[PDB]
Amino acid sequence: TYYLRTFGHNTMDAVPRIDHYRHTAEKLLRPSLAELHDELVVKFGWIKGVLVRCMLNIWGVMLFIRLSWIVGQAGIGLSVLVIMMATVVTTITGLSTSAIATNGFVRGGGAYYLISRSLGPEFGGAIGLIFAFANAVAVAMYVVGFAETVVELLKEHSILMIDEINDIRIIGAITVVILLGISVAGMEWEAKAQIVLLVILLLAIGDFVIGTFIPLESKKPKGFFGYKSEIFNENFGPDFREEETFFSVFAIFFPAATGILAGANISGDLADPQSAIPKGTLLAILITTLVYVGIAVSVGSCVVRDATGNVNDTIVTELTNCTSAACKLNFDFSSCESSPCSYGLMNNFQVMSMVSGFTPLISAGIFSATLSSALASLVSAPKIFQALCKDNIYPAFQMFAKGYGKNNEPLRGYILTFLIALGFILIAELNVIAPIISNFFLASYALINFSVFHASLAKSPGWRPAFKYYNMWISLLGAILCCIVMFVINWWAALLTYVIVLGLYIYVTYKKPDVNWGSSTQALTYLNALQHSIRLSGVEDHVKNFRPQCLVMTGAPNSRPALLHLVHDFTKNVGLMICGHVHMGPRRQAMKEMSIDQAKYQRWLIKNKMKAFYAPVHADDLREGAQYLMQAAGLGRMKPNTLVLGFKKDWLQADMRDVDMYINLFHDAFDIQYGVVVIRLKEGLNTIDVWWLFDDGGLTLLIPYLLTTKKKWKDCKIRVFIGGKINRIDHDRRAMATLLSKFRIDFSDIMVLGDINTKPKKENIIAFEEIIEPYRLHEDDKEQDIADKMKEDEPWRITDNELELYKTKTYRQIRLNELLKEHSSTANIIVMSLPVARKGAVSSALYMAWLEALSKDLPPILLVRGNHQSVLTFYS
Amino acid sequence: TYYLRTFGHNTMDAVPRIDHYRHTAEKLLRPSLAELHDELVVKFGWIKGVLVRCMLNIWGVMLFIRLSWIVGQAGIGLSVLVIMMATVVTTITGLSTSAIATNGFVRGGGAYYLISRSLGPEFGGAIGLIFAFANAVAVAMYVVGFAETVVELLKEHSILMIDEINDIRIIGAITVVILLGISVAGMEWEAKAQIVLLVILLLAIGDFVIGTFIPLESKKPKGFFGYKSEIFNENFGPDFREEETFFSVFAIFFPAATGILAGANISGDLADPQSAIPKGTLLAILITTLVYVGIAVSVGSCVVRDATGNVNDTIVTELTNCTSAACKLNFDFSSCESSPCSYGLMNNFQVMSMVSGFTPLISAGIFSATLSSALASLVSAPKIFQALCKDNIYPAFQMFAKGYGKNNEPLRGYILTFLIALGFILIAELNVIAPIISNFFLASYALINFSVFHASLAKSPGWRPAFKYYNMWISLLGAILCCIVMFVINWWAALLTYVIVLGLYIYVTYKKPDVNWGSSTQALTYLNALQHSIRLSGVEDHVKNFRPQCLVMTGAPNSRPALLHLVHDFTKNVGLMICGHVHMGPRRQAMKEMSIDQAKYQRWLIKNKMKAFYAPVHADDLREGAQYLMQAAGLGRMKPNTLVLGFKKDWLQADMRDVDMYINLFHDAFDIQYGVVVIRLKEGLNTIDVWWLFDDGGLTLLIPYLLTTKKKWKDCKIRVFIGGKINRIDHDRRAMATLLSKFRIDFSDIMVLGDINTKPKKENIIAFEEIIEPYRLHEDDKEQDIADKMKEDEPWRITDNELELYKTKTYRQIRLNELLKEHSSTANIIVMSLPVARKGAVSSALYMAWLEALSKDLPPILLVRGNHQSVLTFYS
Ligand SMILES: CCCCNc1cc(C(=O)O)cc(S(N)(=O)=O)c1Oc1ccccc1
Ligand SMILES: CCCCNc1cc(C(=O)O)cc(S(N)(=O)=O)c1Oc1ccccc1
Ligand SMILES: [Cl-]
Ligand SMILES: [Cl-]
Ligand SMILES: [K+]
Ligand SMILES: [K+]
Ligand code: NA
Ligand code: NA
């Protein structure tokens, strides 16, 4: 029966499957909500790819040469502490790297890809460039270590080509060329070389361990004695026998702990990360740390610090106190504290190859240790560089993004890193440059830990690490410790690397590349905005804290640029600006139109440096869309309180439905207690005159003050016009002066006008009547059928009863325009009180004609009507 | 002739008057917008009340006693440097005080009133308590200085009552009693006493200056020589003949620079501030600094450092070189370096009373200098205390706010400060206390400067200070310098004062007093929220940055508390919660209802730790108000994307118009790309089962993950139910497991059901039909009048054609409820996919019955339908 078929076969709705969430690597092409609702070649495992590579990269030129010197200059306990501090740093860094790795599929590159996809392209580009350069230099430094041991073994025998430095450069160039050859040959060959070096190095470590368990009398003159408790108690203690300190020993040891990201830098060639990187990196760190601690302890409890290389030392046991621990085992290697004696645990770096068995085996271990790390860094650098260049963060380096072969191999990057390493090898004296490279590595580790902390601070639902044990405070502590260790090693190198990081960050944030990766920075932006708004929602309103929160019915924010600039003038950095656009038409097309317009106009607002919000709505007409915006726009206490309208210039030649809707917008704004600002200015193209004739709470006074508080209008002086009575001009002038001095509003002059409430000129009244003519109802000259006109061609038709009952207001508007023409004709901008027409008593056409008559033939003028709630105060 | 009357007489709209902005000190007030729209005893001047008080408070014990010691230890140049540094601190503090005091009317109080009204009651209360205590201690300090000079002048004669440390207390108690008496007498009496002390002190200064232009041979054995250029060139340079440094000298000098707020603590008795405090304080600071500099230079270029007072010191032109500025004038006061000589600039503090003429005049200058400052502190402390107590910030001190007499005089505070000063006088050894009091004053000054900087960083339109020359960077610099100077003297005193300020601030912010003064803190809250939202508006959306932005149709947010808590569970700290309320009725009453409910419900939300926004609207019905909210609610990119509704539990016993409106809310949400979440739980009042059978983009999966994120559901494990095919259970289960492992969604078990698509039980289908019957159209048994029935009692009437076209979907809902009953009966919460009914094809009643049949008789269940835009991702 079909009752037992595939669920979801008898419906259009699709069951969840991986094909709906897969970008490119289809099935059923998951149905849209409308369709359901609308009316009808080389891959490595974690062992060979991560564990082995990190293992080899960590173990370099120090495990077999300089570690004994460290256990000599500092005690066994102090050496263990030095090891454990860097181990803690690398362990926290590895935990953070794992947490970043288990968040999603990592395409290619290493630490760069993780950092850039975690917290964006600025830190990402900075750390990518710095880490790539650090690996390129580390190639030269490991090769220089190889050259040093080669020339040392040649000088031990009878062989020398040129001066020691020149021979070092000559051999190092050859080895770097050979390493470039192996790297170019491909990744499988690199892996084979890596595993053979791993087995040789493990054999060398076993050789050393077996050697320390078989003491011989030939090495008795040396420091070798074979795990004598006297040596243990003697070497346990900080004997710094030169211009050396604990911090300097830590600075010397720290480069050994690096290389933890060799496996993570291969992510572009791993079978799958999110399973390989975490366990491989953690196991590598654990094993390397255990080996370091064990070998340090063994060499400290088996070799004495000072030793004289002569069989002439005797064990006769003659009369001697010999409080030192050298004599307790025998008289060999004693009393070379007066003059510099040849060797021991403080003057010999070959002691590792001494206390062992087969010494050429230890030399081969040296070669393998220093060459595996160089190969790892030489592979690591171009992968990171190519991953960063594919993103085109720095357009100048686009050439190095190319790949070759079946597996994308950056041969240009290989050539570039080979050239950089070769250049740094010819110098061959890199002890000055080593702290800078260590600080670069530390900066990369610190920003990895900060990446985890920052992604955990922002609470993005898409953070979701698969790897547990990644506490955010532990990662923040790891970043802090990385910075501290960076400063401990060569303070000025740390300052310089901070300078480079900051400069690259600024350059990237100025270039502003067009990439969107869902970084933790954007999530943190959202979280900050939400938390700040929630905090603001609990703040009680107060009069001194009032701001003009303006909703402007600009439609497209491009139609009236000058108007939007003017509104921005008294809103930018003070209050809120919402650009309201109402879209009409069929719903399906209008939704797409709004989606396109939102992006386009928000981008235009950002590009033109406007601090405005775009608020598009869909409604059947302008009035109800404005109703939507005036009822619901905003969030919490950031809702608008003022409606800003551009003057309807074409109302004379337009359908009176449109002007009726304009005036109804006025009425609705007054209905829900909004202030209204009407702006009339010439869109084609020093005093600010404020005619404050009616008390609206002070909005018509507050707007021009905010105008003068900006640099654009800083040179314009506010002068005030108020209404008064003749023969009392000075009294009212002084009252106004004291009133706005209590408001601390700077003014240049106050003009009291007594010519208001006087009949305007005959020509002006004739012109107003001529303008009014085609909108009169003329009920006096008509029969009772005019009531039908009052319900069909209306309520915009102008009646005779209201034209006679409001003739005072009409004359006041005309006379006020005459006064504005006579006085404020040469003002930069005019702010004037906006008349309020009582709803249900004044037709739309009469209101619009009042505004036209009052505003005609004037410089930029603002008609303002406040909410009649107090907006100013003179109380503290 | 009425055309020339008062403007605004023939209209209802008023003209701007002072009475419209006056709290209590009439007229007809300002007419409301609705009315125009809706259809039918001691006061001081700045000279006496500020300038004199500040000059008297600044000049204390040091001006006439220890200034010479400072000029002796440090050089003339370093003395001028110390004076200028303290002057810079006090001048920036005075500019900041001026800027704060020229904003609004300052009722009473002093620096407390300014600080509290500028940046709120927390810092305000802290600094009020600290400054009041500091002035109370300073009373005892100045009284102790007066007692010390009295006892010194008594010991110069043969008079002595008891041991010096006890005679000091005996005299100091008497002087503090007399000071309390004169303070209690009244303001006018205190002013007269201050004026006479000012004239006596000016006479003493003139005495010193007149006596320095009169070199007498009787004072020649001492350091007095009378402006010899050798002394000028010799008294430069820092010769510290003790364990004293430059910083210690500065610490000794700084208490002389304080007292700059004496005229600002009298603000409650000034004729008018905003004009008295600025000019008076600045002029007082300038005058005091000029006098300090002149006195330092004069006494440095006139008196030598060391002087062995003896007539036997003569200069008979003996054979000697003596390359020092002692013999160049004469042999007097020469060679007292082997043993400490009796006096001079370094060993004498009475040198001021010696250089001058009449010496008792200088002693009276000492007395006036100490007593005027003590009186100023004793007056200022209770004024600040009673201003702080009138606000009830600390309700334990409410008894100290009451005043007696015509002018409100805090007599209780007077007794309190008298008792504190008397207690500190009995100790009589306050040199340990001194750094604490200096640090208290410095903290007060620093927070004044920070008040100006804060009010300038926030850009409140109501900041508007009347005093220019108040650059905010200079104020920030002054605050930083005040902190630095606080640290320079007695670092641990600075730590202690920071501890007290921090503790008082925490206590006040925990007590949360009910005041609202329009502080700069609230303005900065608004500015920060706006800036963060503007920054967020320029952030491109990404899939892994998606958050659930939910608009919940709660109505009153306390009607369904369990539903509100559940929505909060997956919204708190992640995404946005908007509580939508639709208000109906007449507009005039509904606006007032909305205004009341906004405050009430926002306060209720805050008081229950809910991070939700209240969004009330006025609309004709629920549907169009919800349309308002879905179209316009939110600011920028912080707009809702999901609609959350509670289940209509009473839909059976309700008018079908309401349920039709509910289902139309569903359809409208689906129309504009909104997810819908339906929640059905018992309002009366461990696994999370997710039955997500259709791919909505992942919202049905994302919500219960966010549920498990919270600590309330941290013990609940997500287990998943999907629809599959029999005999392919394991393959589908594995596919689901890998899909949600790529999503990093932790699950306990996956259950695949093949029993879906099978016919439900007979009893359940019978019950569904019985519930359905009352809303059936039954057109098969009727005539063409059913078409009219399908237009009036409609479109909620259920047709037979759709009941047959969607019988499979009905059976699926019933069967799914059976499966939920048998499987998820014990779950803590159930999340299930929400069926999508195609608009125009399924009646409202059929859709509601589908939901009811699906979710009936179950634990708390969520029906979720996502946007069908991708919400999860497995890409990094
Ligand atoms: C940034 C680390 C890159 C390799 N450099 C580093 C590696 C190791 C090691 O153990 O991997 C040990 C040392 S060190 N302190 O010399 O013993 C190294 O410092 C060098 C090496 C050679 C030239 C100059 C500095
Ligand atoms: C916080 C300031 C309160 C007054 N105390 C202060 C005032 C003046 C002055 O000139 O007004 C000078 C000094 S001084 N020369 O440093 O001792 C004063 O320190 C004293 C005074 C007496 C007892 C202990 C400390
Ligand atoms: Cl690394
Ligand atoms: Cl003060
Ligand atoms: K290493
Ligand atoms: K003083
Ligand atoms: Na290596
Ligand atoms: Na004084």
Swiss-Prot record, chains A, B:
Q: Does the keyword Ion transport apply?
A: yes
Protein's UniProt keywords contain Plastid: no
Which residues are recorded as binding K(+)? N57, I58, Y142, P255, A256, T258
Q: What is the effect of changing R30A?
A: Impairs transporter activity
Paired cysteines (S-S): C322-C327, C336-C341
Instruction: List where in the cell it is found.
Output: Basolateral cell membrane
**Residues that bear Phosphothreonine:** T1, T6, T11, T24
Name the glycosylated positions: N312, N321
Tissue expression? Expressed in many tissues.
Q: Which residues bind chloride 2?
A: F131, G259, I260, F441, Y445
PTM-bearing positions, type Phosphoserine? S32
Stretches assigned to the Cytoplasmic side? 96-126, 189-191, 264-278, 383-410, 451-473, 505-876
Q: Which loops or segments lie on the Extracellular side of the membrane, by the record?
A: 155-164, 214-245, 301-357
Judging by the UniProt lineage, the source's domain of life is: Eukaryota
Outcome of swapping H37A: Impairs transporter activity
Q: What is the effect of changing D38A?
A: Impairs transporter activity
In this chain, Na(+) is annotated as bound at L56, W59, A369, S372, S373
Q: What is known of its domains?
A: The RFXV motifs mediate binding with OXSR1/OSR1 and STK39/SPAK.
According to its UniProt entry, the function of this protein is described as: Cation-chloride cotransporter which mediates the electroneutral transport of chloride, potassium and/or sodium ions across the membrane. Plays a vital role in the regulation of ionic balance and cell volume.
Full protein name: Solute carrier family 12 member 2
What organism does the UniProt record list as the source? Homo sapiens (Human)
Its taxonomic path starts at: Eukaryota, Metazoa, Chordata, Craniata, Vertebrata
